[PDB]
Design a protein around this nucleic acid. Sequence first.
DNA 1: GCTATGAGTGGCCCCTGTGGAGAGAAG
DNA 2: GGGGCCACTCATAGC
RNA 3: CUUCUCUCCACAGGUUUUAGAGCUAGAAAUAGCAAGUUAAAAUAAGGCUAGUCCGUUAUCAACUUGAAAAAGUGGCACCGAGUCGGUGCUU
Length: 1136
Amino acid sequence: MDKKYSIGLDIGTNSVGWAVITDEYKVPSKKFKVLGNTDRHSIKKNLIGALLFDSGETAEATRLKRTARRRYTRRKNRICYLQEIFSNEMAKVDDSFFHRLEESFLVEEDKKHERHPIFGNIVDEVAYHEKYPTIYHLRKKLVDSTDKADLRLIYLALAHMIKFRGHFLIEGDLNPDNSDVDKLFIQLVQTYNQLFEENPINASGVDAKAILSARLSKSRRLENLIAQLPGEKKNGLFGNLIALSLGLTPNFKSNFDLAEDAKLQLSKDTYDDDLDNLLAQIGDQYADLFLAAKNLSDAILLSDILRVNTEITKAPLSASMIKRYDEHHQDLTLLKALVRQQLPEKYKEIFFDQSKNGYAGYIDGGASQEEFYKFIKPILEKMDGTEELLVKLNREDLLRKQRTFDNGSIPHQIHLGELHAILRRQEDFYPFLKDNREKIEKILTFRIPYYVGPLARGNSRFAWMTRKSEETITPWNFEEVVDKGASAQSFIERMTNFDKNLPNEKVLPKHSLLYEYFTVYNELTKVKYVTEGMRKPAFLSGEQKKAIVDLLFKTNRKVTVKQLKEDYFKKIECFDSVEISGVEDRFNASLGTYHDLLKIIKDKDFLDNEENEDILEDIVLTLTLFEDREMIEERLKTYAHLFDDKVMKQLKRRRYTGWGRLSRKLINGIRDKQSGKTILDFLKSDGFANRNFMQLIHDDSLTFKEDIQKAQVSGQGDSLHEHIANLAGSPAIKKGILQTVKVVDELVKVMGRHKPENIVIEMRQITKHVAQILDSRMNTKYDENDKLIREVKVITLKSKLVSDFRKDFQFYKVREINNYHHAHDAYLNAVVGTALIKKYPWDKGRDFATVRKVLSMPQVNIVKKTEVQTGGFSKESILPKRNSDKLIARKKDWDPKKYGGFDSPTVAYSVLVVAKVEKGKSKKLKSVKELLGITIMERSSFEKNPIDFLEAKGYKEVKKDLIIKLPKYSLFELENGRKRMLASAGELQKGNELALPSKYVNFLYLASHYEKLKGSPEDNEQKQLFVEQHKHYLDEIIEQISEFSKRVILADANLDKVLSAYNKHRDKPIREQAENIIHLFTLTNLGAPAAFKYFDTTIDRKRYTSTKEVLDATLIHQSITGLYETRIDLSQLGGD
DNA sequence: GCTATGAGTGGCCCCTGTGGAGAGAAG
DNA sequence: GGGGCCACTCATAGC
RNA sequence: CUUCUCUCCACAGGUUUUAGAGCUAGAAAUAGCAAGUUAAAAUAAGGCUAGUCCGUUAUCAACUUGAAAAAGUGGCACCGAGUCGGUGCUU
């Protein structure tokens, strides 16, 4: 007989609970065949379980690593281009200079040339290091000196600037010369007073330098400066100028009574064009005011970056660096003097001991500046004469280095200015510097646009660039080779959705005219109007809709019901009183794009001509796709003969954002085979039918619907791995859903391939995705009317109902005891779901007894999914060289004993190998049987040829047939039922689960929440009395933990510590005792051992660091549900 | 008895921070 | 949070 | 309206080895003194499809077919419950 059965599921991020129950809520038990070479031929197991797995990972880390790799490759290529430029002239001076630079990492033994890189002789190297203590001294020397310098110093300065070219967050031109705040503020005030003599501003006595350069937010500084100026407001014209000078985006619409918004921001790429537009409307007499404001903004921005302006030089950054160096020297001398004068004993600690956070640890050690200040501040406070030192410490300027974390705010314009100064001064002697100055400035300033992406020849899955030619892309011919416009189009396109109705079609922009007309006609479709003498409301005719649109929508931005009534029904149709239903106050759809185009083009006939629909759609698409105005102008140039220069310039100014939901081929692309009208045409006029879009698509008579179902095809692949990958959510939930699908498939396979009556799920849109997938796979048969026969009911509940069911009938849940709660929740969800569904398409004693029996079952199939670990080869921290064989070489020729390297590799999976190993100085062969961990790095070589890989490690005569793949969490069974999971090649994990009786679980749950019960006072008192009467369960729980520990955990030290700790705290309050005992299950939990705290005692974790014991145990392969399993006894393998 | 070796135990180790642009769904 | 690594102590086989 | 997910563009550090002649007294251990701020190269081993590209996401119990994708392989009922046991039928 086909037994009716239901499946309950519980899907989480780390688990998939599953339970199969029959109509009477009893979980069936079946006898399963066991394969392998053991004596256990058949095993009885209840059909209930839980699948556990590691949480899924987001692709953020891989993306960050890939972006970093591209950055590093491109920086290397910049240095290579500079060396290629300098190659011809360097060969005449020193041919081996570049080779010496490259080999600076190798030790003296491994170098092919002389060890000193710059000059190749110690005398000149020492002379250079004495003359220029830091690279900034060399940079300033080249900036200020007019003498012919060595080409090597020029190369060093240029390479240092190119390699560390600073940020690009401030596009435009930045002038370090106007770096004084007060003078430019005074000039701006004077210009404003000259332009506004009737309202002069008194700026006398106001310290602009302090207020504008203070370490406060932009708005606070703006409010502070305005507060010092009588009669001025932060919303005034001068207030807006100051806000612009502080890096805000002030609005000048109110200051000049403009019709449209006038917002200016210097950091934007379009400050110049917006400022020009503002001047074109308010006059060019205000240009000097904006120039002065821009100069003041530059001064404010560069005040922090560069600090010295008194001297006449073109390298302010180098001057500031040298000032930091000199201040550090002076402070170090003073500090040494004071320490040696007052605290001689601490001199060794501060200036010699690298392990501490003193100066020695600050320079040669790894101590940070913050740590150094923390260490030195109490010492300085204990000595006299440290007032200046304390003040500098409070400002984060004492003994400061030159390469700190604050250098992230240096714009690339400073570096470009220094580069240009050096090139200009040194080009008088070197013609190749004169000829190639533009190339060098390009190399420093060239940056791949964000919308072009990686420059690949198709062999990359991340690349969307289109190439005009096949030449190699270089920064000098980037514009000629890479089609920027097509690349921007593809960049925007690939991220937008396909149409829901047609998966092939691309969606239209939101502000397209066709979409707006479609929405307007759809809204007017359902509008009803009632006039005097009319018995029933009537729909608007096509002529009426056309007249209404032409008279109101094309003339008013927003159309209301009152406007319609007063303007069309009363004026045109002569209806004095009309009642309108379907629209409450105003129409949702509006022709904003049409109004904008009428304002710009100023030609209504051009907009209203049907032949111009394609041109207008293309123009709107161009406006929405592109952000750079040059691309917009280039593409709109095709229409230059249709619009004048002013119109073309104005069109270059409007930008649209957002995309629609329906494609053009849907609304106005497909045509009816019988009538030839498109959906838009039907909305314009459909006779008495007046069908809206929903009515048109659902209407069977119209060809559009069946042409739509014919347009969709069954997705190749798709269902299976691909379809779940296309859902909306974190990849963790995708992994969970795929595991749930496989669990259900295997359960169907188990029950004789008879599909279940019901499938109950709880975890809502992701719930909808799971339900759709399950229903799609289960139901595949259609009736004679092509209606899908729902043989399986996919029913979705919410966890609140099951939680209330648990709380009402005392089926309590404690997560820390074991992993059975997943299976129990699946079973209870199945019970409640089936009861509710059969009740709305339950004997008390018998059903409740069945539930008690099920929840007290000891045998639940908990399965840990075996996973081949992948990821990074090892830890990324590079360690100092040591005499150890466990270091990993960062390059093929870099011996870790000399250069250091990586450490702690991660093992992908282990292999059991039976072979012979030479041991001892006698090199005698001995048979071995052990686990060798194949690292992630060596995985490819091992899978390529395991025999050679094993021979290279010293194994001889390898038995190929016995090589067993053992991924992580492989399960081994040992004597007395003790089980261990393979954590790695040399560590194990606990594999057994504690099965407490439900009475102890109930007692623990009631005791832990003794003062947190949520219920009636009588029920709370009854539960409290139940807890108090059953205090002896605590001893029983401890005894059972001890028994299970002695049986499978083998933690004698930890167990004795726990037992002693319990004995000392045996008088603690019952709630505290239970709360602390719940921690003790951390000893017996499945998985990796972990530390835990029991009252005031901390128990360290017990790690199983030996895998020799499992080499003679039983290997268990478990299927995804744990029902089908193959047992292999390893002790019988490798026998002599 | 000495030497080199494996096995158990306790403790320490882990790359980080920021800006800009675009697109999508889900509540 | 969890596996890798090292320093220290103690049987342990072999000489 | 935001959060989250995906993709591209850049920056600043960090670590590693090497260069920046250490001096004096002593046979040496060692003790005293002087100096400290910077720079070059690498930043997953490398791969071929030779690009200013790609290399940490996702997927993966065992056996048979295959290069892989992928397909196939395991009796039922009843009585009980400490990780599942027993009995009958089929066999």
